[PDB]
Design a protein around this nucleic acid. Structure first.
Ligand SMILES: [Mg+2]
Ligand SMILES: [Mg+2]
Ligand SMILES: [Mg+2]
Ligand SMILES: [Mg+2]
Lengths: 559, 49, 49
DNA sequence: ATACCTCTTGC
DNA sequence: ATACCTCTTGC
DNA sequence: ATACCTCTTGC
DNA sequence: ATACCTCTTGC
């Protein structure tokens, strides 16, 4: 029935028991420079809460949903894999929402034309630790001398696990607390699994072989980073980090192979208004001057005519490939979009995000179903397979069935397939763009692969750091023991129930550039209205939510 | 830490830390005790014991 | 030779020697020859060959 | 008197 | 023109 | 007081 | 350590 004793505070220049060590700031600054450059500084802070780990051990676990895949035709459902599980927790902040609110986004997006990522740093403070002790009256006392541990993997020794890919970054609301996630990482494993269908006879091999001892790697924080111990008075801070990576644009393109170059001169123009009064080239298709890449005909049509190269490309879908560890969907860059979609035509390439209350779902809404959406980029660089086709070289037309392959004809005798599903047109002439950011649920920057050769882009984030990326930040509560402890014993050790709270504050800097009017007509711009109006404000209860928004609004020539 | 020098010498620095736990002694005294497993050796052929 | 430097770089120098033997050419001429295993491919299904 | 959709490859 | 199983009892 | 799996983007 | 809804009555 004691308060513990209240203990007394000694005082240095950067801290003590009853001395704050930090300052809260989650404010965003725009600073206009000469020539239309802007320096955007975004501050962000949060109160973070964290419990002691389940157990102070590292574990090696295997996951096995064999049963589900055992089904036949449920290949895609495979979740098998191995992983190391640590006692540490990770503080990840890589995600649009952590840093900006809508108002901000708006601005950026409407007035700028390109954006560069500059630097970033973070710090922790006002640390606090309390212990619970318990008729179920729970009491809480500060444990003045206990500690919080912190480690920053600046060397990037640990494997990299961006958490946004699972919606586990921090929260997006400055005024409400949040937490870090428990850290874990992939551990190697061999695995086989033969695809099958409903109609498939017997049991296609489906097994977990084990682990290529060659491929083994087991890391630990303890052995690789220096751990800091903070007490309340303590505080920690990373330096400032600078990024090396390309800029990101905020404009989208729209021309496709069809709109490149000099359109054909029309010998004949309409003479009155009306949406049926077309113009006419006025020349026999087989009599026109110009250039093609087709040696046989004399036809020259908007679809035949030569273009300098090729925007976009086509690839297989839905493709699953498989290697040593099981199958996985083959990614695309492009996505699709347009008039012939409307989220329902929604296909391959468009990404889809799913998430919780901490990241956008309405706070007050009950029921644990995740909120979702499919981002549909503005950039018209994807494909409409249905429109594709292939024909015989003789090119005698109108064309015969025997000389043409359609998205309609079935391949391999399977009805619901056609060449477009296994087609691929990437090649030296291909040209395209990087994905666009996705607010607020998009990852912001990402690490590059350590392969000898490399992707030309990643699909999860727009900024890929060329060199090293900022090291991960882990934390964890220091074990607080009871008076009984026998390491020699097999049992798990008992600890005092302990937990901690601390504030975290970060600063992320971008640099961008104002855009300027070039066309006569105005352009698209994000804006509020009666329809969405409520998405941007709390409910009479404090309901909040963050809807997704687009990024590359304005157009730009492609050529 | 491994730190490679000229001529193939290395300087290995090994750090190590632990959380140590410790209870108060059974008694704040120094004692002088004798241990006697006479019985066991009493056996004959159990010298080693 | 392996020569260890600062910072764990090594300079590997590999020497190698041989006694080489060589006869006079068959003929002091340059020739332009064609090779033709038509027969083998003539087979049908032996493209690779 | 042409520089990456302005001024402005200026200053 | 030999130095402790290399270069290198050099530099 | 984060640099490309150590020390060490130090010296 | 308060200046006209940011940074910044700073520089
Ligand atoms: Mg360091
Ligand atoms: Mg290093
Ligand atoms: Mg092997
Ligand atoms: Mg292997």
């Amino acid at each position: 029935g004691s308060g513990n004793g209240s203990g007394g505070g000694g005082g240095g220049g950067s801290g003590g028991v009853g001395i704050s060590t930090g300052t809260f700031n989650n404010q965003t600054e725009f600073k206009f420079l000469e020539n239309g450059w802007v320096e955007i500084t975004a501050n962000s802070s949060r109160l973070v809460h964290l419990n002691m780990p389940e157990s102070e051990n590292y574990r090696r676990v295997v996951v096995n949903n064999m049963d589900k895949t055992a089904v036949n035709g449920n290949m895609a459902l495979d979740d098998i894999h191995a992983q190391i599980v640590t006692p540490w927790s990770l503080v990840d902040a890589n995600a649009w929402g952590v840093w900006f609110n809508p108002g901000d986004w708006q601005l950026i997006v409407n007035t700028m034309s390109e954006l560069h990522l500059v630097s970033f740093e973070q710090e922790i403070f006002n640390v606090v630790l309390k212990t619970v002790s318990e008729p179920p009256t729970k009491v809480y006392n500060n444990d003045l001398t206990a500690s919080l541990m912190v480690a920053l993997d600046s060397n990037n020794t640990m494997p990299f696990t961006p958490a946004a890919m699972r919606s586990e970054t921090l929260g997006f609301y400055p005024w409400k607390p949040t937490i870090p996630t428990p850290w874990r990482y992939y551990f190697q494993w061999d695995r086989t699994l033969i695809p099958s269908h409903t109609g498939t006879s017997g049991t296609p091999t489906n097994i977990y072989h084990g682990t290529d001892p060659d491929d083994v790697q087991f890391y630990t924080i303890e052995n690789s980073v220096p751990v800091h111990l903070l007490r309340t008075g303590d505080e920690f801070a990373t330096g400032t980090f600078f990024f090396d990576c390309k800029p990101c644009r905020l404009t989208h393109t729209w021309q496709t192979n069809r709109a490149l170059g000099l359109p054909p001169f029309l010998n004949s123009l309409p003479q009155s208004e009306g949406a049926t009064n077309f113009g006419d080239i006025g020349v026999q298709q087989d009599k026109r001057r110009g250039v093609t890449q087709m040696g046989n005909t004399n036809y020259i049509t908007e679809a035949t005519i030569m273009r300098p190269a090729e925007v976009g490309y086509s690839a297989p879908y839905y493709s699953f490939e498989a290697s040593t560890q099981g199958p996985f969907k083959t990614p695309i860059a492009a996505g699709r979009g347009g008039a012939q979609t409307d989220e329902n035509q929604a296909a391959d390439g468009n990404p889809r995000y799913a998430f919780g209350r901490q990241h956008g779902q309405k706070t007050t809404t009950t029921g644990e179903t995740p909120e979702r959406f499919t981002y549909i980029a503005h950039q018209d660089t994807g494909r409409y397979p249905e429109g594709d086709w292939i024909q015989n070289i003789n090119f005698n037309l109108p064309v015969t069935n025997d000389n043409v392959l359609l998205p309609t004809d079935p391949i391999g005798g399977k009805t619901g397939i056609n060449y477009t599903n296994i087609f691929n047109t990437y090649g030296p002439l291909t040209a395209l763009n990087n994905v666009p950011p996705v607010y607020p649920n998009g990852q912001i920057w990402d690490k590059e692969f350590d392969t000898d050769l490399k992707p030309r882009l990643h699909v999860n984030a727009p900024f890929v750091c060329q060199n090293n990326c900022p090291g991960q930040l882990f934390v964890k509560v220091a074990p607080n023991l009871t008076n009984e402890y026998d390491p020699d014993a097999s049992a798990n050790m008992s600890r005092i129930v302990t937990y901690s709270d601390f504030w975290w504050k970060g600063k992320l800097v971008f640099k961008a550039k104002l855009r300027a009017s070039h066309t006569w007509n105005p352009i698209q711009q994000m804006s509020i209205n009666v329809d969405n109006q409520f998405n941007y404000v709390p409910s009479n209860i404090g309901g909040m939510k963050i809807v997704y928004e687009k990024s590359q609004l304005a157009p730009r020539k492609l050529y």
